[PDB]
Design a protein around this ligand. Sequence first.
Ligand SMILES: C=C(C)c1cccc(C(C)(C)NC(=O)Nc2ccc(Cl)c(N[C@@H]3OC[C@@H](O)[C@@H](O)[C@H]3O)c2)c1
Ligand SMILES: C=C(C)c1cccc(C(C)(C)NC(=O)Nc2ccc(Cl)c(N[C@@H]3OC[C@@H](O)[C@@H](O)[C@H]3O)c2)c1
Ligand SMILES: C=C(C)c1cccc(C(C)(C)NC(=O)Nc2ccc(Cl)c(N[C@@H]3OC[C@@H](O)[C@@H](O)[C@H]3O)c2)c1
Ligand SMILES: C=C(C)c1cccc(C(C)(C)NC(=O)Nc2ccc(Cl)c(N[C@@H]3OC[C@@H](O)[C@@H](O)[C@H]3O)c2)c1
Ligand SMILES: O=c1[nH]cnc2c1ncn2[C@@H]1O[C@H](COP(=O)(O)O)[C@@H](O)[C@H]1O
Ligand SMILES: O=c1[nH]cnc2c1ncn2[C@@H]1O[C@H](COP(=O)(O)O)[C@@H](O)[C@H]1O
Ligand SMILES: O=c1[nH]cnc2c1ncn2[C@@H]1O[C@H](COP(=O)(O)O)[C@@H](O)[C@H]1O
Ligand SMILES: O=c1[nH]cnc2c1ncn2[C@@H]1O[C@H](COP(=O)(O)O)[C@@H](O)[C@H]1O
Ligand SMILES: [K+]
Ligand SMILES: [K+]
Ligand SMILES: [K+]
Ligand SMILES: [K+]
Lengths: 354, 351, 350, 350
Amino acid sequence: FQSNAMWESKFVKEGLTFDDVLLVPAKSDVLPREVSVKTVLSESLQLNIPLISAGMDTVTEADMAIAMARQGGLGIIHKNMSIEQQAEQVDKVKRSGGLLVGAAVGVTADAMTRIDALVKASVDAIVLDTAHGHSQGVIDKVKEVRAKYPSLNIIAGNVATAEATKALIEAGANVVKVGIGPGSICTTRVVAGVGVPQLTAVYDCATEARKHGIPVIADGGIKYSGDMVKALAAGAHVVMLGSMFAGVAESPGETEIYQGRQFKVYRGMGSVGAMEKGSKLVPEGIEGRVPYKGPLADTVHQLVGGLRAGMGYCGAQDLEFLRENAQFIRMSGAGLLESHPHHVQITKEAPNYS
Amino acid sequence: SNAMWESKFVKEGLTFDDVLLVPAKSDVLPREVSVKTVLSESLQLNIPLISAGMDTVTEADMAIAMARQGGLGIIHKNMSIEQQAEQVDKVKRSGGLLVGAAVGVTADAMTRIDALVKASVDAIVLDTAHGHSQGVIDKVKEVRAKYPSLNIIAGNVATAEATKALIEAGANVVKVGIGPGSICTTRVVAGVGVPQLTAVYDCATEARKHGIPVIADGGIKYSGDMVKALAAGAHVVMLGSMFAGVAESPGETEIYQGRQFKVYRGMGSVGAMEKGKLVPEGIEGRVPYKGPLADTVHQLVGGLRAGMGYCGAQDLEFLRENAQFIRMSGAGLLESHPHHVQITKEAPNYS
Amino acid sequence: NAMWESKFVKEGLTFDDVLLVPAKSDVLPREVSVKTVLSESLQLNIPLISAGMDTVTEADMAIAMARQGGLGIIHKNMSIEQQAEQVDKVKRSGGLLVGAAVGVTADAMTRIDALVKASVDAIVLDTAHGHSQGVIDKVKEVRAKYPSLNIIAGNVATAEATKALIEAGANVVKVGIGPGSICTTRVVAGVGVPQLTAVYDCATEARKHGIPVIADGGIKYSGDMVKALAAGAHVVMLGSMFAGVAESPGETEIYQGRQFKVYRGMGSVGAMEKKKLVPEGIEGRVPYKGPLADTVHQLVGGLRAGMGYCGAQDLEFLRENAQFIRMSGAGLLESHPHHVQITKEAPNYS
Amino acid sequence: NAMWESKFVKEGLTFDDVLLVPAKSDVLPREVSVKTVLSESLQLNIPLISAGMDTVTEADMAIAMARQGGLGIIHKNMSIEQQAEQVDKVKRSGGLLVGAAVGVTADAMTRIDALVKASVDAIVLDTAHGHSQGVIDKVKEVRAKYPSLNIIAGNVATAEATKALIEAGANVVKVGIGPGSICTTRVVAGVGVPQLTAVYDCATEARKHGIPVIADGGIKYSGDMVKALAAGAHVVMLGSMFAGVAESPGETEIYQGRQFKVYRGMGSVGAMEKKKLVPEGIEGRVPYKGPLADTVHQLVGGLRAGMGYCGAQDLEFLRENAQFIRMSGAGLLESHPHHVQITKEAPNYS
Ligand SMILES: C=C(C)c1cccc(C(C)(C)NC(=O)Nc2ccc(Cl)c(N[C@@H]3OC[C@@H](O)[C@@H](O)[C@H]3O)c2)c1
Ligand SMILES: C=C(C)c1cccc(C(C)(C)NC(=O)Nc2ccc(Cl)c(N[C@@H]3OC[C@@H](O)[C@@H](O)[C@H]3O)c2)c1
Ligand SMILES: C=C(C)c1cccc(C(C)(C)NC(=O)Nc2ccc(Cl)c(N[C@@H]3OC[C@@H](O)[C@@H](O)[C@H]3O)c2)c1
Ligand SMILES: C=C(C)c1cccc(C(C)(C)NC(=O)Nc2ccc(Cl)c(N[C@@H]3OC[C@@H](O)[C@@H](O)[C@H]3O)c2)c1
Ligand SMILES: O=c1[nH]cnc2c1ncn2[C@@H]1O[C@H](COP(=O)(O)O)[C@@H](O)[C@H]1O
Ligand SMILES: O=c1[nH]cnc2c1ncn2[C@@H]1O[C@H](COP(=O)(O)O)[C@@H](O)[C@H]1O
Ligand SMILES: O=c1[nH]cnc2c1ncn2[C@@H]1O[C@H](COP(=O)(O)O)[C@@H](O)[C@H]1O
Ligand SMILES: O=c1[nH]cnc2c1ncn2[C@@H]1O[C@H](COP(=O)(O)O)[C@@H](O)[C@H]1O
Ligand SMILES: [K+]
Ligand SMILES: [K+]
Ligand SMILES: [K+]
Ligand SMILES: [K+]
């Protein structure tokens, strides 16, 4: 009947994102240079740094995955290519000294065929990427892959609620990817009206996944290295970055001079440009440019450096302590203005602030 | 009694940019969801879109295009009674299409309604600035007593009491929206308004008891705002600025800075009132030319279908009854839009 | 330990935080009564007062304001003789109501005596901090010598300060610490109360004694005046919205083909000159708007629209029954015109 | 589970989130006392300390700050002999008070020995994270060797951190992690506390031991200083507001016809080289302001006006009695001047 308790709970929940909070410094006994940033995603997947490059056609291919793995991270080779081409990218990364590599797979009828070639190429993890992870199609596809490959690392997403996280874990997924709408090139929340603020989404999903011993991945919305520290402190084992990697030298594509500086193309996989590469349509992403940042090593050094400093401020020896003990404090828009530089004209741009 | 003095600053309101829709378990794909909606027995739409009854938005060509897309058009009342009845008759002659017409609360209101009924209009829109007026209530009772089977759309209102008053007067559809229009200054020049998402939610809460649908009119800037309006209790949304740049809109295309634009102004603006001193409650402006209506409608329905898919809603009734929101700050809004990226090209659904 | 734990308890609201809730209405906007009674000998046909500033109100402004049904406050940045002649000029042109600003100094009573001889209708004892012992002692001194004189005291922003001035003998209290468009008090001194909360807090106290309050400062559109009156104020005082009017002092200057007029705070460097100075105001310019009658028509028109939305037959009903709803910053962007390139200016929105 | 469920419970306020509520005042701004006592051997006529940065305070700045009634902290980006000569130069200029900054290294004890022999008045054991064991162990090592030396330890932003440094030997605590105008700690590390909540939380613990705190960073206008003192701080520390005066280190540059001075964070690349460093500061420029005396007069002038609004005859009354009121971003826009095109620059606003 009309006894709709859902009607009066429509506007009950509240959500927080990175710019809403700060990490509260605590007693510390460990220097930043001696903290442990290693993380374990499964029994056959350990990362020395908690950084994964996104599986997008302007972010990660073979050269990016090789450079990411040599930094201690992981690269997800995108799926906007043929099955044999993607397997050739995976095989190229594997032969380069026994490095880790991942590959993205869509939820289509041809998914099992693509996963077969990736497993034959000795892929370490597949990423069942989709816009709405909490669908029956993704759930059924996780179970079919789990039955065929019991020892394969499966990364499933994207989700933003605890119930969605529970459904993917009991379907076979050993890693859950969190993020509906936070991406720098994403318009899902604008054209569809759906999303969860990324920090609340990471906290709600990690709350459910910690009951089963499953890690979660913070995917999208990270603009500065401090946002990565907040995502890990909110419960995530590892973060996935797109915009902060699209400008590095190992990224696909060359440099074009724009506004007098070198720029690189960065576009969403749900944009018009990306969807036509693998084919009106209602897009959920945009196309654009990010500044050129030189080699990947210089960017990863700044990222890890900011994490080590933040863990020093919080007294975290390893990521598990930060995940379980770090406390936040909420601030208003005025607090954000105070957090950034203010009332001073910046002359030289810093390696970690633009 | 100091009850009214102590409750002045108690209520709180939310707009579209304050909230997001929470994803839920989904068994349906966006292309297999149903966007149909029923306002009454004699007024069913294939898509939940109504074009605003404004002189720069909807005339005969716009109403014909809206109906052939599955929606509805409201012929504006800034014309003679014979001209509005003739435009209604043109739309009906184009294949029995659904069409509406706007009527004010004046002395010639019944005369204009008499001519619109003879033209076989499908719905009368008694539109006024303050729907919670005694004159508006009396007019609805005067029309309902004369035409017991006529679809009467009354507005605009923004509170639960006003919704109950118009329903008890005879209105079978209620229009919600005081202030949120893109060309509206009512909240600025008069200080009166209710945040549109809270207004829709409060009016639908009262209207759902009596089985009366509400129209979310004004404030919609992207296709995601329409999803939030329907999820908040609205059966159908009304759009103005989203339809002004469409080729089927009345008025020719102007050239400004080489680009193509179309005039868009509020019915309470100075220019609109001089057509048919003054204290205006709207402004006059221009919007970019968007081309044929079919391209704009495709993007709007596509975002709605994607939104219903995220929420696991097969039909619009499930969205109204089950969709949950989450509140966010301004920082959440900035995260929701694209950010820290130099946009290269404009998207079809993101301007 | 109670004062230490209550430092951050209070919350405050301003005009852009709220909207008025429409209500059942049986009255058309052209039927409403905008009259207001400040005292037995001070009745206004419109709830509008022009601020006592040297770029807003002099003889010509006060004459035009009073003819529209309002009131003008002649500023005090002039000699006693010159201010007495300004007041007499307004009285000699039809017997119009007029007010005059007076500061708290040793010269205060001498200036008040000349204004009273000029048949001034209301003295505005305007100071930066109305909640001081010097201002209170001055109000008792003036009321003792002039029992029938209308005394407007300010500025204050708390219920405690409102009660102190009423018990001192003031019959009208002026509210506003910081919200002025040219004011920097909250920036340079860190002190203030959000104007809508200040009006409501002071009106809550003043209504117990049957004393009206003036909402002074922060009004940038006609809708802000409606909110201030609905929050408990009997009348509003405007500065920036009258500084561009032709009847204001100063000439019109043209900048990039558009006319402007000078507008500055009385605590700015320029006003007090007319290194050792620490100002609490800035100096700037506002667009030229032409005759006062056009601005007043838009102002009263916007008020009549708002009173119609609220079902207020008179200002006393709106003062006691109007309800607000709070909104965020996204609600403010929705309230203003948005996502449309504005082609031409409106007479009440620029 | 308790630590997991309390992650997002606390809420923090900054300067632009609140205003000071005006109260009854029997005291004029010119007759209030702005003196403060940090310890028995460190008393200041005005509550101003210039930051220990290579673009803010050296010998000339500390001399001018001391002659104005404040204190200057010699930065540590120089050899031990250079810093001792700078401290000695300030002492030779009429027995003026001077402070010196010291880092937490193995060289710290040797640097402190040379500063003590130069008759330094207070050392500033400054570091990025004052709530670490190395900073605690260093304070205890310095306190044991110099029981009468004024030790200012920081930086911190938590009551627990304040207690740890107090029990280690520090008689003055410096509050501030993030709010600096040139600081990017909160951006690149994600760590910080809104400055006004940090000052209030740390002063809450410090006052239970009779220990003063220093509000360090985030002050953009004179009103922010009044809020920091009213939040519980005995004295404020300024960097950006002092870097543009003549007495600060560096020389004047020209940019777009105006005069500027270089101002950079000590955690910036330029300050540390004086691509392996991960900086927590930026390099920039600030407009030239002239002699220090003109800036100090506007700062103290804002404090005297704010204390007059609050009815605080001394700084102790302001810390113990001043009440705040919270406001939204709309209230912040009302606080600043608005809807008026500013024509002239005020000596205390932009
Ligand atoms: C004012 C700032 C912020 C600043 C100034 C100059 C330079 C810095 C740099 C950029 C170097 N960043 C920094 O040192 N970050 C930091 C972060 C977290 C922690 Cl826990 C620590 N912990 C230890 O504290 C004790 C002492 O040994 C310190 O040297 C350090 O090793 C340090 C920053
Ligand atoms: C990263 C994003 C957002 C993105 C990337 C590339 C492309 C897209 C596009 C723009 C194509 N939009 C999208 O797919 N929208 C969407 C919306 C709502 C729902 Cl419920 C679904 N549901 C189904 O999920 C399971 C699987 O069947 C999927 O194929 C899908 O049909 C999809 C978006
Ligand atoms: C805001 C919109 C959409 C708008 C559109 C065109 C024009 C207007 C104008 C600018 C004319 N302003 C308006 O009419 N203001 C208004 C304010 C308050 C009240 Cl109470 C009323 N009451 C109505 O008076 C007339 C009659 O319809 C009565 O029945 C009653 O409803 C009207 C505004
Ligand atoms: C409208 C403003 C703000 C303004 C207008 C013109 C000039 C001013 C100036 C810039 C001069 N600042 C000012 O006076 N600041 C102020 C601050 C705090 C207090 Cl407590 C007081 N107390 C007053 O001392 C003198 C005496 O009148 C006392 O009775 C009492 O009123 C004054 C400001
Ligand atoms: O076009 C798209 N629409 C919505 N989300 C996208 C799209 N393309 C990439 N994403 C997401 O955004 C993430 C990277 O965004 P960023 O790191 O914040 O710039 C990816 O890992 C995806 O999860
Ligand atoms: O001038 C006016 N004043 C106030 N509201 C108006 C005016 N003109 C149109 N509207 C409203 O605004 C709606 C369209 O606004 P939009 O869809 O946001 O651009 C219309 O359907 C009316 O409800
Ligand atoms: O310089 C000043 N400092 C602080 N407040 C002022 C100053 N000058 C005028 N005001 C106040 O600001 C009001 C007008 O401001 P406005 O109408 O909002 O622009 C006046 O009536 C005074 O109450
Ligand atoms: O580079 C740095 N990183 C972080 N904080 C800094 C740095 N340099 C100075 N600070 C802090 O910022 C204060 C001055 O900043 P300001 O007065 O707000 O502009 C100093 O007293 C230090 O506490
Ligand atoms: K900062
Ligand atoms: K986004
Ligand atoms: K509007
Ligand atoms: K102001």
